[PDB]
Amino acid sequence: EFFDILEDVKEDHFEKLLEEAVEEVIDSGNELVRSPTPSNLKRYKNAIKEFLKLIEKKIYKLNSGRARLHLVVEEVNEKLMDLTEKIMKNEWQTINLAARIEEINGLILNLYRE
């Protein structure tokens, strides 16, 4: 009986962890946009790293789901590599950074709904 509440505490805990990770992805996307520093590019990359561990766990520990996951993560990392490459080349006038970030957020939020 108590092991039925235990699983509920576990589920809710992990759900609050996972929500919070979504927020940190948006919060640091938004900060990266305001000052595209090196220190912020990584609050970004890190936050998205942490987001992808938690959702893996949820999608696994539960074939169409895993297949979106594999291909969307593949997409996120490409865009993360396009983004980086363009900060490093100092291509600040074609970068389109706010929009590169709505788009990567867009994809993280699909993932969250899955």
Token digits of residue 28: 């640091």
Write out the H or E segment, with its range, that includes residue 46.
helix 38-60
Task: Yes or no: say if 28 and 49 are a contact pair by the CB < 8 Å rule.
Answer: no
Q: Which of 70, 74, 71, 100 is nearest to 85 (CA)?
A: 100
> Amino acid identity of 102?
E
B/e letters for 31-51, b = 16+ CB within 10 Å, e = fewer, are ebbeebeeebbebbbebbeeb
Dist CA 102 CA 26 (whole Å)? 9
Residue ranges and CATH numbers for the domains of the chain are 1-114 (1.20.120.490)
* Residue written as token pair 């939020």: 109
- Distance between CA atoms of residues 93 and 61, nearest Å: 44
* Residue 82 and residue 103 in contact, taking contact as beta carbons nearer than 8 Å: no
Largest CA distance in the chain: 61
Q: What experiment produced this structure?
A: X-ray
